[PDB]
Design a protein around this ligand. Structure first.
Ligand code: HEM
Ligand code: HEM
Lengths: 394, 394
């Protein structure tokens, strides 16, 4: 189909033709669901429009939620302590300033050796076995460890924390009461501990800055909400980047050759893989005013889907070859991590995971096979990530 | 309709004819959903069968959930720390023994004066106004205060705790992430405090008995799960009892007269109101073996709905007048609180709330009007409770 529809597990394999039809024939596309026309919304598919809209938080607000479902906030129960990703400036600004103290080059650097050691252990296990499911074995557990690091979870607690993570990621994707309860409970204790034993992580930084101090329960709640944002934001996305890169690399031995011969080209290659996988394929905003983009006026009060995945594939920005892998492309202004106020805090951490995984795949498992038709994609309309990528090595 | 269907807001007004058709023509009724026949289940509608099945936890297990939906436990996320209501003996037995220490006559007696003071304040406010919505004003907030008492929540925290309660009750009925997180967070702190400042409540008793002691995180989790059981079990049910009693009393001035002339008959009247309102109208079990009841064999591995609401209206147990209010009936072996291992821990607390509310309604607002067709019932197929009961007083 070339007709717009929110993605499902069955339609994630190849949304690209549908994106191209939108970019070419209806860049400001009005969706009116036949069964509930009251839930109409708009879709932005071009790079220029998505880039500008992401930046313009004034006009395009995050404060009513990030899906095209108008009942979202009440449906999930996120009105009273909205996560930072559903806050507009100025509310968003102070908390983002404080938490950013846990997202410096230091925090990416300190976990890199742990990432590499884990990637190596799992890839060697897969190699010895002639392959296996690289998602369950590596691409799923890896990002959970990195989120744990950023939350200052002691290494000894990583296995327990991963249990909760996986339940929440599954429930969030498209149902995790024990996990959401156990986690919010665990973090209550960790926050308390960080009052007297602060480290360099984001939770320690929030506590040290006085968030939740002197009976400010709302502050403590904001820290807890941040842990949920981290778990829901830093896991399935990374798995989508890592798993989604596999067929792209497999089908382009010329591109693998470039990186085998020049491993120093791997950071640039990571940008290209991020552009093409765009794990967050789209997120919504709500218009605060009527806004005209080209020949269409979007009314105030409607949801607008920013199709990062299409923006990243826009021939107007990247050329007629936008749909193809070119590891030397050095794409700029990618929308994989959005743009503006909410630009992904974990961008450096995601880039580091991609770099280490790609480096070790080429070094340890260079003769590998992926069957694209055997990939199983997760349900859910916003994030594109595989549940399984069968993987064979010789 | 007289054809079996799970109840909705629209069908809660009058399920009784449908129950009677089941009792008379298909007491062991096989439901095969046309759209998903793989989700077939059975319904028990007679008192004798429901009484025996509730008692026989061996044959009729709670461990797979309490609804007729086979995916229930994973859908809600309650596998890893199953609540006590979804535990079978022997697992269920120790925890129930420990927590029962917080459900003695002492705990009902200590909160009664607070209940009465609140009922009085709200009824006087309604009287002064010539009526209003007795659900929002009284029948909703009251049971939340009583659950707070049983959880050892300090009175100063009751307003905050009610906020979370209402979100969870709405989400549980048929979506409360901030509430479920804030509550599980709050209780983590309260449990910690009870380690050194124990009171006579159920949480204090669990902590004093060593549940969660010495790094036993699973124990602490069980206490947290119990708070959720309490919030989901002790609120909408009581509101259903109180609100559901209103039309029954209104339409029977002879029955009100009996209690105006003999207020000492009110405890017995409460049993009759519990029988007719049966707020938990049904809950499911799973068969562990093939079981024959009359001419029908229920296979092992299927859900069986125990229709407490029909059992309570069974002419075979209560007589041809089973459908009618008789405050002097003194019904015995009611199934309002089930029967056997899981018999409602809050039965005494529910009975006390009914008694106080009924006593004060007759004393303060005896000339009152309820329009049954104006009552709005909550969605959800298991608990029958109004969201609104318009109420007028002269
Ligand atoms: C390839 C992997 C990732 C992708 C594609 C991705 C994508 C995004 C996007 C698109 C946003 C902005 C959302 C919007 O437009 O409304 C965002 C925000 C965010 N991301 Fe990521 N993310 C990734 C990995 C991570 C990781 C690993 C972490 C944590 C270590 C993380 C933490 C966050 C946080 C905390 C925000 C909220 C920032 C704010 O609202 O100010 N992300 N991410
Ligand atoms: C009219 C009001 C109430 C009704 C109709 C009701 C009904 C029930 C029923 C039918 C069960 C057994 C569930 C099953 O068959 O699987 C139960 C269990 C339970 N109820 Fe209630 N309940 C009411 C009020 C309360 C209150 C006020 C509290 C707390 C103060 C409470 C706490 C509990 C608990 C903790 C259990 C679990 C017992 C166990 O599984 O061992 N209930 N209730």
């Amino acid at each position: 189909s070339h007709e717009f529809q929110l993605a499902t597990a069955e339609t994630w394999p190849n949304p690209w033709p549908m994106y191209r039809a939108l970019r070419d024939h209806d860049p400001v596309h009005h969706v009116v669901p036949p069964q509930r026309p009251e839930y109409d919304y708009y879709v932005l598919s071009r790079h220029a429009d998505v880039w500008s809209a992401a930046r313009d938080h004034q006009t395009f607000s995050s404060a009513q939620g990030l899906t095209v479902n108008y009942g979202e906030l009440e449906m999930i129960g996120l009105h009273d302590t909205p996560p930072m990703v559903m806050q507009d400036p100025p509310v968003h600004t102070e908390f983002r300033k404080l938490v950013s103290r846990g997202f410096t080059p230091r925090q990416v650097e300190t976990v890199e050796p742990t990432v590499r050691k884990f990637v190596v252990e799992r890839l060697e296990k897969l190699r010895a076995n002639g392959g296996g499911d690289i998602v369950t074995e590596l691409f799923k557990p890896l990002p959970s460890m990195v989120v744990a690091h950023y939350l200052g979870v002691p290494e000894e607690d990583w296995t327990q924390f991963d249990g909760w993570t996986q339940a929440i990621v599954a429930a969030n994707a498209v149902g995790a009461l024990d996990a959401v309860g156990s986690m919010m409970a665990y973090f209550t204790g960790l926050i308390e501990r960080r009052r007297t034993e602060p480290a360099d992580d984001a939770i320690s930084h929030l506590v040290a800055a006085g968030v939740g101090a002197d009976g400010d329960t709302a502050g403590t709640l904001s820290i807890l909400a941040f842990t949920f944002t981290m778990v829901t934001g830093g896991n399935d996305t990374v798995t989508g980047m890592l798993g989604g890169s596999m067929p792209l690399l497999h089908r382009r031995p010329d591109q693998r050759r470039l990186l085998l011969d020049d491993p120093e080209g791997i950071p640039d290659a990571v940008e290209e893989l991020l552009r093409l996988t765009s794990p967050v394929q789209g997120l919504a905003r709500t218009t605060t005013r009527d806004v005209t983009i080209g020949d269409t006026t979007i009314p105030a009060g409607r949801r607008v889907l920013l199709l990062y995945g299409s923006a990243n594939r826009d021939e107007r920005q990247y050329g007629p070859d936008a749909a193809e892998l070119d590891v030397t492309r050095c794409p700029r202004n990618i929308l994989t991590f959005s743009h503006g106020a909410h630009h992904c805090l974990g961008a450096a951490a995601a880039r580091m995971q991609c770099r280490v995984a790609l480096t070790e795949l080429l070094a340890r498992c260079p003769d590998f096979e992926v069957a694209e038709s055997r990939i199983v994609w997760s349900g859910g309309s916003y994030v594109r990530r595989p549940l399984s990528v069968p993987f064979r090595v010789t």
